[PDB]
Amino acid sequence: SKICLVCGDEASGCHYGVVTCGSCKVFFKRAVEGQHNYLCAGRNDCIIDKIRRKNCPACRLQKCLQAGMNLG
Amino acid sequence: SKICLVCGDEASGCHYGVVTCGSCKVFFKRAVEGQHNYLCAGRNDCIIDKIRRKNCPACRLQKCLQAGMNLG
DNA sequence: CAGAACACTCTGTTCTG
DNA sequence: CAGAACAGAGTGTTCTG
Ligand SMILES: [Zn+2]
Ligand SMILES: [Zn+2]
Ligand SMILES: [Zn+2]
Ligand SMILES: [Zn+2]
């Protein structure tokens, strides 16, 4: 496939176990080892797409997890 | 109140008609004047508080207008 | 492919008449 | 008070093993 399983932007290959775009790749790496205080403002099922992926990083991260992205 | 009617943060007085913090004051004018494409990732009722006011500018603008802000 | 180093978005603060 | 404008976190792209 050529679409990111997380946001639907054009995929640049398989990153951390899942086919993702470059911004989802580094969002995930940064989420896992960084210092964020993400919090959903809706009901933990925000729509994650290219247009809205910056809106709820907390749902973005959860969607990354469910798709199976991992470091290990 | 010292409280912002849009986001609950400590308010710096009445701006464009409504008691607001400084961030919402300048968020509101930037929104209205420079219209661009804000879209809710939930169901257009995102909680707007200090921790989460960057998440959904569409709802943030929506709460601003309801609360009564304007430039006229 | 994983990471680094860059550049961008947008926001929020401080300063002013 | 409204507005100018600098500084910042968070994000995204380009590049370099
Ligand atoms: Zn993506
Ligand atoms: Zn969410
Ligand atoms: Zn506010
Ligand atoms: Zn919303």
Author numbering:
A (entry chain A), B (entry chain B): 600 to 671
Paper lines:
Steroid hormones exert their effects by binding to steroid hormone receptors (SRs), which include the estrogen receptors as well as members of the NR3C subfamily (i.e. the mineralocorticoid, glucocorticoid, androgen, and progesterone receptors). The SRs contain a N-terminal transactivation domain of variable length, a DNA binding domain (DBD) containing two Cys4 zinc fingers, and a flexible hinge connecting the DBD to the ligand binding domain (LBD). MR responds to aldosterone, 11-deoxycorticosterone and cortisol, while GR is selective for cortisol only. MR is involved in responses to stress and is basally activated in the brain, but is most commonly studied for its role in vascular health and salt and water balance.
In this report, we determine the first crystal structure of the MR DBD in order to provide a framework for elucidating the subtle differences between the corticosteroid receptors and interpreting the biology of disease-associated mutations. We then crystallized the MR – GRE complex, obtaining small crystals that anisotropically diffracted to 2.4 Å. The crystal structure of the MR – GRE complex reveals a canonical SR DBD dimer bound to the GRE sequence via interaction two DNA half sites. As expected, the structure is very similar to structure of GR DBD – GRE complexes (r.m.s.d. <1.0 Å). Inspection of the MR – DNA interface reveals three amino acids that make sequence-specific contacts with GRE bases. The terminal nitrogen of lysine 624 forms a hydrogen bond with the N7 position of guanine 3. On the opposite DNA strand, valine 25 makes van der Waals contacts with C7 of thymine 13, and arginine 629 makes two interactions with guanine 12 at the O6 and N7 positions. In GR, the side chain of histidine 453 can assume a “flipped” conformation, where it occupies a position between the DNA and the reading helix. This conformation can also be seen, with minor variations, in the crystal structure of MR bound to a GRE. The MR – GRE structure reveals that the MR dimer perturbs DNA in a very similar manner as a GR dimer.
